[PDB]
């Protein structure tokens with residue numbers, strides 16, 4: 296199969312993702328590899344169109360500010376569709392962590408640093424993603440990159456949801472969600488993964504008398520990061536600038 300984006304032809308190699316949007320692995324005329332995100336605007340309302348346009352403008356602006364944000368090379372927006380030419384990753388973080396038995400402490404730290412940089416950048420532009428999960432990150436050349444910003448309208452998981460989001464959102468909400476991802480990378484499960492029932496799980500996340508277990512590991516700095524991120528009171532939670540100065544990210 297084939298497709299045109301701003302007068303340039305792309306040969307389709309395979310389908311990567313998919314609701315009213317499909318993501319494909321493609322090749323250009325110069326035989327280079329990209330990802331084309333196709334979005335169908337056929338049954339999209341004005342609020343939806345506006346959320347999609349807002350996300351595209353933020354992605355395109357924030358390109359320049361950090362290499363930990365996915366590259367957007369070009370796009371074609373009409374009334375019926377959106378075509379976005381982006382860089383191709385190797386795998387998303389969720390699929391990678393699910394396949395992998397154990398994570399090496401060096402790659403985890405490297406990945407954590409990238410997650411902090413990408414999220415820091417969005418916060419500096421007034422954006423709180425509000426729905427961070429490992430699916431929002433992409434491995435590209437041993438480098439973790441953020442794929443989206445949470446503006447445009449793993450499906451609806453609550454394992455990474457901060458207590459304040461369950462009650463109701465400041466940058467501290469993204470800190471909780473990032474801590475849950477690092478907790479998965481550390482202990483092999485999210486802090487409340489063991490609770491099947493969604494109601495009982497939402498009740499545990501908000502419950503202060505419900506103690507999050509932090510089993511002893513050889514990395515005390517890593518244990519401290521986790522305890523700092525996973526503080527139920529947003530006022531008592533560590534900030535991104537504070538996490539970037541933490542020993543876990545700096546020592547050695």
Ligand SMILES: c1cc2cnc3ccsc3c2cn1
Nearest residue numbers: 318330382383384385386387
């Ligand atoms: C947008 C762009 C992507 C680029 N590359 C990859 C590679 C695996 S998922 C994915 C993407 C998913 N959404």
